[PDB]
Structure formats: structure tokens, C-alpha cells
Design a protein around this ligand. Sequence first.
Ligand SMILES: C[N+](C)(C)CC#CCOC1=NOCC1
Lengths: 213, 57, 339, 281
Amino acid sequence: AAVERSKMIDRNLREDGEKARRTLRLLLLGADNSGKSTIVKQIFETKFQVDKVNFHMFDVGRRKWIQCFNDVTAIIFVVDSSDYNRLQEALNDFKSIWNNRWLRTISVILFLNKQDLLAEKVLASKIEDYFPEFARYTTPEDATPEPGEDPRVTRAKYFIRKEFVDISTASGDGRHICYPHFTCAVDTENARRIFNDCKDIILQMNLREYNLV
Amino acid sequence: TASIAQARKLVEQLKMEANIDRIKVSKAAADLMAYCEAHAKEDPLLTPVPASENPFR
Amino acid sequence: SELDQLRQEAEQLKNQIRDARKACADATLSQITNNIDPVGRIQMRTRRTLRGHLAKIYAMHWGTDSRLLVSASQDGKLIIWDSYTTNKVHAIPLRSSWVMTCAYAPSGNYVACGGLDNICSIYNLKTREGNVRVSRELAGHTGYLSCCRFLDDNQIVTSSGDTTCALWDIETGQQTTTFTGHTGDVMSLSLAPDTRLFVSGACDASAKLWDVREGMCRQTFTGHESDINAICFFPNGNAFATGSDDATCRLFDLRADQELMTYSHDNIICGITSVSFSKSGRLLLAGYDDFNCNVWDALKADRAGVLAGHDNRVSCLGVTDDGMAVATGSWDSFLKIWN
Amino acid sequence: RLWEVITIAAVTAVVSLITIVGNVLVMISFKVNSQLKTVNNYYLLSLACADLIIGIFSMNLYTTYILMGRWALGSLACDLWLALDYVASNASVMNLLVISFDRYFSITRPLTYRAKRTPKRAGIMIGLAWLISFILWAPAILCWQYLVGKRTVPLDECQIQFLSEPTITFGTAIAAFYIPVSVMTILYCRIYRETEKRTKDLADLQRKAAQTLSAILLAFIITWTPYNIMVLVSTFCDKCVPVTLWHLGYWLCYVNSTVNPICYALCNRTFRKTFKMLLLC
Ligand SMILES: C[N+](C)(C)CC#CCOC1=NOCC1
């Protein structure tokens, strides 16, 4: 009698495990006043669906509970690109997350938030004072500014991305990949950017599944 | 006065730690040694029980 | 002025503690237990394997008897097992899947659950409805819950991630006594067999002994070099052992008020998740991060045996009240019961 | 001449033993490892079962037929062995086609397919593959002598009787090899395009696919092409194809079943780890 109750439980356990494996779990991280809550316009849990694929975002309101998110699909790291005093702190916060023991197979979806305030700051306040490496730095020739923006904005934006990808290419070596981006205050395409990056993460897991990449 | 009261309680907690009976280690280690020897017959892990008495197979 | 004088007085008081502990030291545990024969090779093997979970298993707790054990995983399921027959008595669903701790009542009528939701959920098992119902929720912690233990099926002591420990009342849902002595967040808690004293291990390399009635820190033990996330009492109740990420297990004595023995191996580098003692306390079992858990002689500091049966990180370890079996749960979907 | 047939028997015994222990290891590595009990590895168990049926029964009986120079086991045993061999070989190729479709769907649509990779779809694809193979070969082999009315195959030898009739031969070759190798080549080329594309897109936001992906296709093509060429040349030019060249083609088809585990199962690290565990014991 008790064996049949245990078998009836296993039917209910496998039914709940199919729905749990059918969604993607995401970890939302970032500093204070970086607009983590305004990334997606749809512990705290956030649910949104893109192309009939369910996503789950989790943020905790320090470095010990990161072991609970060992099996997430990606980590959404949000950086305030407007201010420069906390930008070095955000670079060190990303370096500890990237070079973590329990985060080696977990890709990071980087969100350089507040790019409209970054564009307003560089057109007026000196990025060279907070970063000596911005001097003697040139924009690469294979650069495509999308909205007809100023080259001073594009050089500033490419420098902030560069500092966040030399950290990612120093370690990992293809196990997990940082996927940079840029976000305004009223950008509504962040749900597609997470969907396209989680498309690449599962694809890279499938290519390692078949020993192709 | 919250910091003054918490510092006063931390001093009183250190006074309670100082006013304790500190039995010597050689008397303390002999107590755990004698307790391990007296209960060694009743330990099923130190002394392996036969499979008839053991309910796990 | 006044704050600097109090800090200098506290530094002089801390120097008096170290000088009293150095004067109290006369011999080591290895010198006393040099004539004691070793336990030999341990041939402990897996008897039962519990394959009903679906995610990483973070905690487990035995019952009063050696039959029923609760288990908590990251799939939002709190499965109560029957270890004799590898059955499933209950399959309790949780509101939050982020669960780091679970507990079993000594009476067996209740279980506890907690994690990143900052809420200690008590579930009643002996109900007339035929299903497990949520009895009470304790939401007085501002940090993540890491451990919880029942005292007498009405009071539960919980250790949280906001550097605090609290004594609860189930029938009222209020914090009876709050223990605020740690600077780092507390990741482990154990109860002494007389259910009156308990030591909590936090991440500031410090284990502090507390009283459930006085509400004051009786002793502070600072011997570890890294963060502590594992603690357990000796069966005598006059000593306790800790497990840190420094690959070191340290046995602290309450009466001697300092460290007795360091169960460290130079081959072991990775951290320790969970520690527990045997029935007599001579075997100390520690769960490591090298996919296995080792058995340590508590009086000789020798690696007695390796319980290599897991292909992932072992996170919880429990020994029954009569010491018949040891069940280790890991980050796979399996609990393995040994002997 | 005795040393030649001893060498042939030794080589065929070594390759039959290799494929038997390989498919047995793939079954044991699925059974004892619950991490390998996924939806996509059911296809590999199907493939392993087909290759074990090929390695146990088909290779040894074939070799004995070549070495003795005659069947000498009855016409019914010849027909049953031919039906089992052709059904198992086509089931293996159908399993390769289904694995290629699964890889293509999980690579080009890595998120949409994850909700359609249920165990019921994998079971119905495996059942459809085996049913297509059985329907394609078993009534054609076992019942051609009753449809014609005469058994034109001599009693001492063992050969499919319809291999002389041009139509059924081309039909059962384009339904068994040419359309599957064409679909597999197209799907794996699209897979290569997707890998190159992701690497470029990632570099626009911020190889190993040349060896493995081109060693799967060539290990299939080299080991299945000469039989499917010599059957289509033998259906017209009666005695063009030599006898030893024919036997070598027939055998090579089995060689593919030997090298099947290494190209599909062993690619997955969890299998390599389980095999390194299993071998030593
Ligand atoms: C001739 N042999 C039995 C060795 C292999 C065969 C066959 C027929 O089916 C297939 N041909 O190639 C693809 C499947």
C-alpha cells in the first residue's frame, strides 16, 4: 500500500520536474541605483515570457548565497555606465563574480545601463581622470555606430565594454561567455536581448553536448 | 545610550566568561576517554554488529 | 575618546582571554590519546540510495527514530523518506524553491523549512485532512535562513544570514530571544543533547556558544582561518566540532575554552560543508567539496575512511540518534545511506 | 591459403568483439548512470541495440558464409538472417538520420525544441525508424520468392533475391541510403553554418567543428558507399563487380556499425568518463 503511494508521488514529482525544466532561471545582479528593477518592463521573483519561452529572474535584497544559483542559465549583471566613481567598483564586482568557484559554467549577460546619461556626460565629467587607459585609445575600424551617434560617444561606449571583456577573456577560456550590451532609460528591447543571449548559451551547451564547439 | 548599554553588557558577558570553573585538560580529556571506553560496547559503528541483528540488510 | 578607551579596554580583555587560554594549555589531545588504539580501516558502503529528487539537495535531518528522514532540495520539494524501505511518506511542496535548511521535530509531528525567502515555514504532518498543511511562517529575519532546529516541538532556534540567531515560538510566531553577537552571517547551528546550550558557527571564523534562556554569548571560539559553515556537538555535550572552507576540522572544548585537535590533511584543499559525530563521538564525519566525504578519528586526527559514492558536491550529512546509519545528500538528485 | 583465411577470421573476430563490447558498454553506461538518462540518449540506445544485433548475429554468420564458401544452413535460415541483417542495418541508418534531425533541431532552435524533446517524441521517432526499416526490408526479402513463384537463389549460397530486379533495387537503395545520406549531409552542413555564425555574432557583440562533424559524415560515407555503388552496378552489369570487392563492401557496412559508438556516444564527455570508469572495473 505504501509502495503505491510512493509510486503515485513519483508521478507527481516527474510532472513538476518537467515544468521546472521547461523554464530558464536567471540571476539579476548589480550595484545600487543601477536600474536592475527597470531592466525588464514586465528574495524577489520576476516572470516574463519571450516567444513562448518562460524566464525567471531572481534578485536578493553577499558572496555566500551565490552557491544557490549554481544551476541558473545566465547571470544578468547591470552596470551604471553614467557615473565613473562607482565604475571601478562595478569592474571589481564583475571580476569577483566572473572569477568565482561556483560560476565557471555560467554565462553573464552584461547590461551597461543608462547609456543615455553616459552620452550626455561625454558631450559636456572627464572619463580620462577616472581612467588613465582611455588616453591613447582609438576606436577599432570594425565598429558600427547604430543610431548615427557621435564618435566621442562611440569611443566612450567601446572603452567601457573593453574593460568588461578583458576580464571575461582572461579566465574561463570558452566555458562561459560574457555577452555585453547597452541600455537606455526607456529601452524596451531588453527582453529580446536576454532571449537572444540565452539562445546562444543553450546552443553553446548543445554544441559541447555533441562535441562540435 | 544604546552603545553604552551594549558595551556594558559586553563587559558583563566577559565577566561571566571570567567567572567560570576551568577544569584542567588532563582531567577533561580523561573524561572523554573513559566515556568512549565505557560506551564502546554499545556503539554499532565502532563494533560491527552481525547481519542478523542489523536491520539494514 | 570614550570609544577609543572602550576599544583599548576590549583589546586588553581579549589579550587576557588569550593569556588565560595559553596558561590553561598543558598538553594536547594527541599526547593523551597516543596510547589509544586506532579505529582501523572503515569499510562503510552504501546501503540505500534515494533517487526521488530532481535538483541539488542542500539539507537533510533525521527523525527521533532511524526510520524517517526529511530532505530539502532546490526543486521546491520537501520529501520525507522512509529509509528502511526507500519509500516516500510525504512530498511537501514549498512556496520558494531556494531552500538551504530543513528540520525534523523530535516528536515527529512537524517539519521546518527555510532558505533565501527569509521565512521559516513549519509544516504539520499529523493532520486530519490527510495532507501536509502549512502550520506557521516565521518572517522576522532580514537575512537568508541557513539552519533551523526544533527544541521541544514548540520552540525552534533559527540561524539566519543577517548575523543573528533567534529563538522562536511556534504558537505565537514571535522571536522569544534574539542572539546578536556575530559580525559575519551564520551558516550553521547545532543543539546540545540537554537542549539548553547551542553554538552557532558564522563566517567571521568564530563559533559562539549561546544560552536559550539567558540569551547571552557564553563563550567565543576563534581558531579557524576561514569562514565556518558546519558545526555539530559531541554526544557528551561538553565539546563541539566545526567545519570551515580552510579544509580543517577543529574540535573545541567548552570547559577548556580553546581548540583541542585540528583534523587537517595536506592532500585536502577544498572546503567542508557538513560535520556530524557518531554515537560514541569517536568518528567525526565531514562532507567535503572533492565529491566525497571522509571519516575522521576524533581522538587521533587520522583519516579513517573515504565514503566516495557521490559524483557531485556533498552538502549535508546526518547520523541517526542510535547511530545505525549515516545518510549523505549531495548536489545531484541522490541521498545515499551508509551502513 | 590457410594463412589468408586464418587472418580473415582473426580480423573479423577482432572487429566483432570490438563492436560487441562497445555497444555493451554504451548500454551499461546508460543503465548505471542516471545523469545519462536523458531524452537525446534514447536515440543512442536505439542505435546501440541495432549495432549489437548487427555485431552479434550478422558479422559472424557473414564471415562463416565467406570462409566456408556456401551457406549450408537451409533456405529458411538464409532468408531469416538476411531479413534480420537488412532490417538491423536500415534501423541503424534510420537511427543516424533521427540523431541528425535531433541535433539539427536542438542547434537551429535551441530553446523552442527543448519543450518538444519529450520522451514520447523520442519513443515515437525510434518506433517510426524501426517500423520503416521493418516494412521496407522484411516483407520484401521473406516474400519475394512467393511473389515471383520461384526461388532463383541457389541453395548453397545466401543472397537477397530481388537484387537482380532493377526497380526494387534502386527504390530500396534510395529509400535506405541516398535520401538519408543527402538529408544527413544537408543537416550537418547547416549545423556547421550555425556554429560559424554564432562565433561571428558573438564577436560582433564582444575549429573543433571541422574534425568531428567531418569525421562523422566520412565514417558513414566511406563505410556505406561501396555496397550501395556495387548493388546499383550489379543490377545491370551482372559480373562487373568482383567477388572479393563485393565481400569487402558488404563487410565495410558492418565496419560502420563498429565505428558508430565512437562517433555519437563517446563524443559526450559523460560517456567518456563512464567508459573510463567501466573498462578498469
Ligand atoms: C548489406 N548489409 C546487410 C551488410 C548492409 C545493408 C543493407 C541495406 O540497408 C541499407 N543499406 O544502406 C543503408 C541501409
